[PDB]
Design a protein around this ligand. Structure first.
Ligand code: L04
Ligand code: L04
Ligand code: CA
Ligand code: CA
Ligand code: CA
Ligand code: CA
Ligand code: CA
Ligand code: CA
Ligand code: ZN
Ligand code: ZN
Ligand code: ZN
Ligand code: ZN
Lengths: 160, 160
């Protein structure tokens, strides 16, 4: 079993942008989310501006080309696929959500970090404070965010 | 993508039993859980008493031969793998839980039905009342259980 990338150097591409935030803010959020994982593993990510990258990142609403259509405001916020070729490893964000860079609304960085966890092969955690918990919740202060030991052990068991 | 069985006739085997309930009660719970899905799809399940079946069902505690050890009482109640050969499609139940046939404790039938959903290729639902919701909750009256329309649409989109 054990679904994981057979390589440690991964590429990603931000296929399109959400109009909720300025371009630079989307880039920063995605970059930060990736750094969260690079800090505790031997993985590195390189950005591509064309073609197909291992991790294709996009914002879409309702039916968007795959088997799982989004559901409008609320409920499912995004979805990501486990490691593998093609659609696998990709992360889609529901643009019917209002993506933010702060504590209000739906914070892009927080959700992006979680989705990338799935793209790397992680399942959910039972720890209510773990990044990989199933339900989203906003933080009072973003600087209070940190990976729980559960998150670290999980990703390290897969890579190193 | 779309992880699903390439066949509609599946076999299952109850590899071992939990001492929490009498044998006949475990068989009944598993049988009922399978019937839940047979009622809304063209799938059929046949029981095997030896060798490897597509869906291997077992009760275990802590480290049990796979990559994901159980965690003692509470937290993760069980885990099942998506369709595929070998360990894929299998469902493991944490025996550190007290499995019951009624509304108290951890109801085996309810959890088994959910796990089988995963074994068939389903992901979680955002509907708090759907069988495929991420968090377990006991019912006041078992006869009040029924698949939500979300559960039905999901399994039917995969099979028929
Ligand atoms: C019952 C759930 C639907 C509830 C819903 N949750 C989601 O939307 C999740 C949110 C993920 C998340 C969790 C914790 C933190 C966090 C924040 C701060 C922090 F400090 C720590 C952690 C951050 C992000 C996104 C998807 C859902 C995948 C669903 C299953 N599916 C379908 C599918 C299709 C294709 C591929 C895979 C899959 C697949 O898995 C995922 O889990 O990745 C939720 O909370 N909604 C919500 C919350 C508040 C307000 C409004 C709505
Ligand atoms: C944050 C969660 C951990 C919380 C926890 N949830 C679980 O344990 C789930 C329970 C499933 C379930 C949900 C609803 C109903 C129901 C009941 C009545 C009804 F009317 C309708 C519905 C029935 C069953 C089982 C696993 C967890 C998979 C975890 C991720 N992992 C690891 C992994 C390893 C290998 C393979 C795959 C996977 C994989 O996915 C799964 O989702 O299948 C919970 O609730 N605990 C709890 C609740 C109450 C008291 C004590 C504890
Ligand atoms: Ca991909
Ligand atoms: Ca949504
Ligand atoms: Ca939006
Ligand atoms: Ca199997
Ligand atoms: Ca447990
Ligand atoms: Ca037990
Ligand atoms: Zn999608
Ligand atoms: Zn998730
Ligand atoms: Zn297991
Ligand atoms: Zn589940």
């Amino acid at each position: 079993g054990i679904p994981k990338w057979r390589k440690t150097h991964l590429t990603y591409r931000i296929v399109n942008y959400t109009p909720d935030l300025p371009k630079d803010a989307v880039d920063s959020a995605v970059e930060k989310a990736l750094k969260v994982w690079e800090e505790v593993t031997p993985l590195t990510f390189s950005r591509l501006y064309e073609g197909e990258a291992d991790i294709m990142i996009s914002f879409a609403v309702r039916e968007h080309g795959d088997f799982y259509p989004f559901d409008g405001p609320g409920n499912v916020l995004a979805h990501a696929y486990a490691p593998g070729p093609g659609i696998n490893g990709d992360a889609h964000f529901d643009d019917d959500e209002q993506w933010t860079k702060d504590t209000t609304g739906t914070n892009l960085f927080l959700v992006a970090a979680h989705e990338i966890g799935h793209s790397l092969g992680l399942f959910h955690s039972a720890n209510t404070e773990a990044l990989m918990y199933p339900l989203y919740h906003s933080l009072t202060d973003l600087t209070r965010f940190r990976l729980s030991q559960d998150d670290i052990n999980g990703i390290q068991s897969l890579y190193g």
